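Repro case for the chain-ordering regression, as requested:
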Amino acid sequence: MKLNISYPINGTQKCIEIDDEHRVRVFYDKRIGQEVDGESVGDEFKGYVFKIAGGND
Amino acid sequence: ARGPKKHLKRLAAPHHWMLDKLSGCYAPRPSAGPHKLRESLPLIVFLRNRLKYALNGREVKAILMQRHVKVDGKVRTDTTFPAGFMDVITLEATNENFRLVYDVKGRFAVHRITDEEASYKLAKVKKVQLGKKGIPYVVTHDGRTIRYPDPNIKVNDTVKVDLATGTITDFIKFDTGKLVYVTGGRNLGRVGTIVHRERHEGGFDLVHIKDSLENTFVTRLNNVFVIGEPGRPWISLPKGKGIKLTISEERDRRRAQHGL
Amino acid sequence: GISRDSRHKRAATGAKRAQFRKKRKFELGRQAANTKIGTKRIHPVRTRGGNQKFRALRIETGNFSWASEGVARKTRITGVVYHPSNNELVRTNTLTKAAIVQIDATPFRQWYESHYGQSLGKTSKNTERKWAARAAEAKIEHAVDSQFGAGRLYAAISSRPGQSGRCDGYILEGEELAFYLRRLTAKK
RNA sequence: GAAACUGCGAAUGGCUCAUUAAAUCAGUUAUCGUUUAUUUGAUAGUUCCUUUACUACAUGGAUAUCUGUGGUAAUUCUAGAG
RNA sequence: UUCAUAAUAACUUUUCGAAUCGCAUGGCCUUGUGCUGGCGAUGGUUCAUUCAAAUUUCUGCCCUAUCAACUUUCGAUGGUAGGAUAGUGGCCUACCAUGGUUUCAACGGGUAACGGGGAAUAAGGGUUCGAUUCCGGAGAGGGAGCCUGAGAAACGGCUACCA
Ligand SMILES: [Mg+2]
Ligand SMILES: [Mg+2]
Ligand SMILES: [Mg+2]
Ligand SMILES: [Mg+2]
Ligand SMILES: [Mg+2]
Ligand SMILES: [Mg+2]
Ligand SMILES: [Mg+2]
Ligand SMILES: [Mg+2]
Ligand SMILES: [Mg+2]
Ligand SMILES: [Mg+2]
Ligand SMILES: [Mg+2]
Ligand SMILES: [Mg+2]
Ligand SMILES: [Mg+2]
Ligand SMILES: [Mg+2]
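-- result from build under test --
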C-alpha cells in the first residue's frame, strides 16, 4: 500500500505507491516513534534512514 | 434562567420611560451601571422619545458616535447607558445641557439647564465605610464612590460632586427642616420640608414631608434625596417645582389657560 | 452529582416531595477531599465565580500556632491523632478541621531558642540584657513542655483542607488542651 | 487582509406546559448567609534578601494558520515532518 | 456582630504587583542621541455599584375520609462535631437524643393542574376559565452525568444508557 515519506530540511516529500508486499512487511508490528532502515523497505531506497511517526488505518 | 437576562420586553419596560405600547416588541434594557434597572433612564429613550433629536435608534447610535453627548463629564457611546436621577447630560452641539429630574407626575423631564450649574451633580449616601489602606470612603446611591470624605458626611446625607474632576464641593446634612426631593413611586418627584424621622428598628425609616402647600406625606428614607435647606434648593427644578396638585386643580389650570 | 438540594429530604412532616427539576449546578457539593499526610500535593478547582479553591491532597506540613507567645512556623505534621467527629479519619490518617494532631516541634524549639532561649524538655554582651528583660514571662502548661520534649505537640487544625489547600492549625493550650488529652487516653 | 489562535459571545431571545398541589407562583422580608464576567466608581515606591564587578534598552522554546507528505466507502475525521 | 478596619505570628505545591498594544513627537541641554513628558487601549487587586444569583420570612392553592393516621431499617425531627458548598443548612458523614406533622384535615390519591398577572360572565355576592403577547417557573425523545465558562447540571455543547 501507499507510503508517506517526508524530508525535514530541504522540504521535499513524495508519494511512493507500493504494490509489492515484501517491501511493506518491514513496518509490521512497530509503534509510532521509531527508526527504520532504507535497504529492507525497497531497491530504490538504499542507505536511507526513515523514522516511523504517523499513519492511518 | 441559566443566568442574567439580556433583553427587556416592552410591556415590562418600566413605566417612566413612557415607552410606547406598540412600535416594538422590546424595550431598550438599561445596561448595567450606576442606577437600578427601573430607576435609570437609557439614552435611546432620552434622545428619541423625550427630546426627539433622533427620529430612530440608528440616529441615536450615530449621535453617540459623533460624540458631543457627554453624560456626567465622560462621553458614552452606549445607547442604553443608565442615565439615572441627577445625571447631567450635556450635548455640546446646541449647548442643551440637561439634568435628569422627575416631573411631579413621576415620569422624568427635560430640564434645559444652564452652562454652568450643570457642572456639579448632587449625590446621596449609601456608605460611609472604610476600605484598604484604612481609607475612609463614601458612596452615592446615585452611582459613584468618592474617597476621603469629611468625617461628618453621614448616611442618607447628600453631597455635591465636582463631576468633571469628581471630588467633594460640599454636603447637606440630613435632619429636621431640610428641603427634600423624593424618588419613591407614588410620592415620586414631590418636594418638601421634613418634620419627623420615624426611626424604626429593621422595618425602614419613614419621613414626614410637608410641601409648599403643606399637604403632608410619608415615604421611606431610601426614596428621599436632600436637595437643600428650605427656600434654597441646590438644583434648578422644573415648572411645577415638586408641588403635585390635585386632579381637579390640574383640570382647572388647563381649561383656564387657553391662549391661542 | 452529590447535590445539596432541599428538594430531596422528603419534607418537614413526611410528604415525599416530588422531584421538581433535575438538580442544578448551583446546588452542588463535590467529592470529599479527606487529605492524608503522605507526599505534599494540591489540586485546585474552578468553583462558583471562577475562584481557585485549592483542594489539599496528602498534605504534609502546616503553620500551627501558639497562643501565649503568638507565633507559628513552617511546621511539619506527624499524624491524625484524634478526630472528634468520626474515628474513621484517625486510622486512615485523613487530616481535617478540628482534628487533634502532632507537631514536629523542632521549629517550635529553634524559634523558642531565640524568643527567650531558656530551652524546653528538661555569646554576646548586649543581648544578655534583652535575654534578661525577656524570659520568665510564660511558664507553659506542663503537657506542652513534655510534648516539646517529645518532639510532638498537640495541635487542632482549623483550616478547611478541602476548601483552603493550606493545612494551617492551632497548638492546644489550657482547658481544651486538658480536655482533648482525656479523650486521647479514653481512645487509647 | 483570506486564513487561523487569543479575546468575547453562543446560559440571550424563541418555543412549549410534561412534571409540579405549600412545590411552583404573588406580594412580603431577609443574605449580619453568599457568588457576581460585564457595569461604572476605586486603587498597589517594600518583587531585592547582606550591600566591592548584577539579563532588564526587553528571557525561553513550543504550537497553530501555512509548505507539502496522506489515508477514507463515509464526516464541518485530521497523522507525520519543516 | 466574632462588622468595617487595624495589629502581633507565620506559612503557602507563594496568587497579585504590566518582559502587552494604537495614535501624538513635546521639554531641558550636563550637545549625549542624553534624560525626560501627551492622548489613549486593554489587562490586572480586593472594596464599591449595576445586571443579577442562590437561598430564605410570613400568608395564600383545585377535588377526595370510597385516603386517619403518616415520617423514622435506606435522615424522619432535633443536637454536637466535622465533611462539602460561593455560602446557610440533615445538603452529606460520625456519635447521640426521640422527635416531627395530624380532624385548625397530617399522610395518601386524584387533577382532561404549570403559578400569577388576567379572561368571560356582569346590580351586590359570585362562578367558571387562564396552553396562550407580561412576570415567574419548569422542559428540551427520556432519565443520567459532566467540559468550558462570571453564569449551564446548557441540550441549535459533549459522554453514556434506554426509546
Ligand atoms: Mg429562556
Ligand atoms: Mg436590615
Ligand atoms: Mg471580620
Ligand atoms: Mg471579585
Ligand atoms: Mg457545620
Ligand atoms: Mg399538567
Ligand atoms: Mg389553575
Ligand atoms: Mg399562564
Ligand atoms: Mg395540556
Ligand atoms: Mg415565560
Ligand atoms: Mg418531540
Ligand atoms: Mg441535559
Ligand atoms: Mg437553548
Ligand atoms: Mg434544540
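Ordering looks correct now. DSSP finds three helices and 18 strands in chain B.
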